[PDB]
């Protein structure tokens, strides 16, 4: 019985910390390691245009800045703002594609870790006619370590990008 | 697929509207209902004498005021303070009772809804010899409906809190 994750920490001196690893290239930080919480700090600017579907629930609390979700809900492109002091819980495989604008922002996201066998899902859709254009699924044991080469193989790739309905390349990295 | 949890709200906002109920009689309210993520934000003043043996971790953030939560670390009774601004993760099954002295404080607790036939603790020591002096375990479903008649019948009962060791009675409530 011990304090494996350390005592508690003061959080916005932490973020505050790591602001220049919540800023491009990355954009990321994982709080603690090895947790079956996995509690990261998201900052900005990012966009991206993978969705996600994440076979467990997530929760968000926007701590500063504000950011927004881009998601599919009930078959509908949906926008769900995160503005600064906002919290919200995703049910688990609502596709959702996060975009942080803002520099400076940084948002709680907190999710658990995925049993053996239980697969996340990275899509991309076609802007044109909004079929799937790409799915790869992974057992996702590091954020970091696992998702870099697989968006990366995507924008690859012409034939990955091609839409299977109606022909149109998916544009890849914006 | 939908949001089955609603829209994004703003938290300091929510904390302010449900302040009556972060305050005793209860001290509790959760945020999101028949989800896996259990999210509360608990408020003060409340003192409390079991320790929680959860089988699962819990994330803490002080958002508003100081809370500390009684600990067995490694044997020795240990203090981690949860000063305004502070989280921390704790591990599975470290014994804890958290005191919250402050009126107007909240609390961001995160927890998971527990499977099938794994089972949460309570237990209360002896102020004397140290000693475990009672335990009940449960299948929790339902924080506010399965913890009062528990808590309420460990004071109700001289027996249940006789120290095994040492013969003292727990004083029960306080
Ligand atoms: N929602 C996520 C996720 O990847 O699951 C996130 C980015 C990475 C860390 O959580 C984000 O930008 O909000
Ligand atoms: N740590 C808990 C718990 O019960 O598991 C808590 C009280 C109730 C709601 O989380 C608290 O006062 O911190
Ligand atoms: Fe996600
Ligand atoms: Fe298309
Ligand atoms: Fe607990
Ligand atoms: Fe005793």
């Given at each position: 019985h011990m304090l494996t994750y350390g005592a508690p920490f003061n959080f916005p001196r932490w973020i505050d910390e790591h602001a220049h690893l919540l800023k491009p290239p990355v954009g990321n930080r994982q709080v603690?390691?090895?947790?079956d919480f996995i509690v990261t700090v998201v900052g900005g600017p990012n966009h991206r245009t993978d969705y996600h579907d994440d076979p467990l629930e997530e929760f968000f609390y926007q701590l500063r800045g504000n950011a927004y979700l881009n998601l599919w809900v009930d078959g509908r492109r949906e926008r769900a703002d995160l503005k600064e002091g906002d919290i919200f819980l995703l049910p688990p495989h609502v596709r959702h594609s996060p975009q942080r604008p803002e520099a400076g922002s940084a948002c709680l996201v907190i999710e658990r870790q995925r049993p053996a066998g239980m697969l996340d899902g990275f899509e991309w859709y076609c802007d044109?006619?909004?079929?799937?254009?790409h799915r790869v699924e992974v057992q996702l044991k590091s954020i970091v370590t696992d998702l870099p080469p697989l968006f990366e193989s995507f924008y690859a790739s012409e034939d990955k990008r091609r839409?299977?309905?109606?022909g149109q390349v998916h544009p890849g990295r914006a």
């Open positions: 603690w390691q090895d947790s044109a006619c909004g079929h799937l254009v839409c299977p309905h109606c």
